[PDB]
Design an enzyme around this catalytic site. Sequence first.
Site, PDB file in Angstrom:
ATOM      1  N   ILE A 170       9.054  -2.888   5.295  1.00 20.07           N
ATOM      2  CA  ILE A 170       7.861  -3.651   4.902  1.00 20.07           C
ATOM      3  C   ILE A 170       7.600  -4.680   6.014  1.00 20.07           C
ATOM      4  O   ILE A 170       6.464  -4.847   6.452  1.00 20.07           O
ATOM      5  CB  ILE A 170       8.079  -4.350   3.516  1.00 20.07           C
ATOM      6  CG1 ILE A 170       7.981  -3.365   2.336  1.00 20.07           C
ATOM      7  CG2 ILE A 170       7.157  -5.580   3.311  1.00 20.07           C
ATOM      8  CD1 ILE A 170       8.293  -3.991   0.946  1.00 20.07           C
ATOM      9  N   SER A 203       9.729  -8.305   8.356  1.00 20.89           N
ATOM     10  CA  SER A 203      10.824  -9.206   8.689  1.00 20.89           C
ATOM     11  C   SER A 203      10.559 -10.553   8.066  1.00 20.89           C
ATOM     12  O   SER A 203       9.512 -11.152   8.310  1.00 20.89           O
ATOM     13  CB  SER A 203      10.963  -9.348  10.203  1.00 20.89           C
ATOM     14  OG  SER A 203      11.191  -8.091  10.820  1.00 20.89           O
ATOM     15  N   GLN A 228      12.568 -14.433   6.666  1.00 20.36           N
ATOM     16  CA  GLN A 228      13.290 -15.569   7.255  1.00 20.36           C
ATOM     17  C   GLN A 228      14.771 -15.224   7.429  1.00 20.36           C
ATOM     18  O   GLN A 228      15.372 -15.591   8.440  1.00 20.36           O
ATOM     19  CB  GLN A 228      13.136 -16.820   6.362  1.00 20.36           C
ATOM     20  CG  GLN A 228      13.440 -18.148   7.068  1.00 20.36           C
ATOM     21  CD  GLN A 228      13.422 -19.342   6.135  1.00 20.36           C
ATOM     22  OE1 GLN A 228      12.400 -19.682   5.523  1.00 20.36           O
ATOM     23  NE2 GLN A 228      14.548 -20.041   6.047  1.00 20.36           N
ATOM     24  N   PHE A 229      15.348 -14.506   6.445  1.00 20.46           N
ATOM     25  CA  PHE A 229      16.763 -14.153   6.426  1.00 20.46           C
ATOM     26  C   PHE A 229      17.092 -12.738   6.903  1.00 20.46           C
ATOM     27  O   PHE A 229      18.239 -12.322   6.797  1.00 20.46           O
ATOM     28  CB  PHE A 229      17.381 -14.437   5.040  1.00 20.46           C
ATOM     29  CG  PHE A 229      16.861 -15.656   4.308  1.00 20.46           C
ATOM     30  CD1 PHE A 229      17.032 -16.935   4.836  1.00 20.46           C
ATOM     31  CD2 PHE A 229      16.230 -15.531   3.075  1.00 20.46           C
ATOM     32  CE1 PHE A 229      16.564 -18.064   4.155  1.00 20.46           C
ATOM     33  CE2 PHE A 229      15.766 -16.660   2.388  1.00 20.46           C
ATOM     34  CZ  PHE A 229      15.932 -17.918   2.936  1.00 20.46           C
ATOM     35  N   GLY A 230      16.113 -12.013   7.429  1.00 21.80           N
ATOM     36  CA  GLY A 230      16.358 -10.661   7.925  1.00 21.80           C
ATOM     37  C   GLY A 230      15.211  -9.682   7.812  1.00 21.80           C
ATOM     38  O   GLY A 230      14.144  -9.891   8.392  1.00 21.80           O
ATOM     39  N   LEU A 231      15.449  -8.582   7.090  1.00 16.76           N
ATOM     40  CA  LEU A 231      14.506  -7.479   6.905  1.00 16.76           C
ATOM     41  C   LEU A 231      14.126  -7.303   5.438  1.00 16.76           C
ATOM     42  O   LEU A 231      14.898  -7.666   4.550  1.00 16.76           O
ATOM     43  CB  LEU A 231      15.179  -6.189   7.412  1.00 16.76           C
ATOM     44  CG  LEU A 231      14.537  -5.404   8.573  1.00 16.76           C
ATOM     45  CD1 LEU A 231      14.282  -6.276   9.786  1.00 16.76           C
ATOM     46  CD2 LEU A 231      15.437  -4.266   8.990  1.00 16.76           C
ATOM     47  N   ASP A 275      10.065 -25.342  -3.931  1.00 12.60           N
ATOM     48  CA  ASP A 275       9.278 -25.031  -2.729  1.00 12.60           C
ATOM     49  C   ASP A 275       8.089 -24.124  -3.041  1.00 12.60           C
ATOM     50  O   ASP A 275       7.831 -23.164  -2.331  1.00 12.60           O
ATOM     51  CB  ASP A 275      10.168 -24.483  -1.593  1.00 12.60           C
ATOM     52  CG  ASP A 275       9.534 -24.367  -0.207  1.00 12.60           C
ATOM     53  OD1 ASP A 275       8.651 -25.183   0.119  1.00 12.60           O
ATOM     54  OD2 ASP A 275       9.957 -23.481   0.566  1.00 12.60           O
TER      55      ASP A 275
END
Length: 264
Positions: A15, A17, A19-22, A128
């Site tokens: 889908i 990328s 913040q923490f990866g894929l 957040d």
Amino acid sequence: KWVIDPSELTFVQEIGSGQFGLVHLGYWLNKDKVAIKTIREGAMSEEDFIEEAEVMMKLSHPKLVQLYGVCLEQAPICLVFEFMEHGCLSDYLRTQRGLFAAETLLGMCLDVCEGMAYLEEACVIHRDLAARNCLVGENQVIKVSDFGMTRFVLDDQYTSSTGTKFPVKWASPEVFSFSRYSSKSDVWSFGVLMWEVFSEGKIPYENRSNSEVVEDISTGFRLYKPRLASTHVYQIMNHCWRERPEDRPAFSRLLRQLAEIAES
Ligand SMILES: CCOc1ccc2cccc(-n3cc(NC(N)=O)c(C(N)=O)n3)c2c1
């Protein structure tokens, strides 16, 4: 159980990328098509996170993106969510800018508000809430996601109020000053989220640095009226941006107020 065995997951397409990866579009065995987010080791306190799984997995509402479980056999771990076909609210507003009826924009705020009134009743603080954290699914339904996630994020520059990357733009004064989180501080972020919605995905306080946002807010300055927000909608937005959390309406009150405006 929240534990998903690797054999119960198939990755079909990337889908994007995060913040923490894929992020992958995949399938979850005997269940459904899912969005799988791979988490880079060190990005989050995985142990504190898994501790809340039993209680937190029980949260379910048509207006929240469901997080089904965690595939954690080996590193990097995977978070398994319901698939939201149109992606994040922020990009959806930006790419469809100029094609939105005011009622659709209002309807989008109402979806988030119902989601948030459910979290408020459940005593769950998002921390957040922003358009980037909301997703668009079938028939333009908006669902809230990533609630409580900043309690596990390991980057100090994002979590600490004095951090270089602290999301100050959605922070209530008591949040930017003391990290005093509540459903009332979420109400302030919701007010900012409504502005992002009616502005068709513009960046709030784009012309200001973090410290300038803090000084403007403290001195009573607020975000200007978006062209598509009616005076009744902009007043509801301003109620969200009241300096004292106690003078801000609850999400349960906002839900009844916004629905009366929509339903005419
Ligand atoms: C298997 C779910 O495990 C957890 C563990 C800790 C959590 C802490 C904070 C928030 C959680 N959390 C986040 C969720 N959904 C999304 N889209 O973010 C849900 C849910 N029930 O849908 N629960 C958590 C969910």
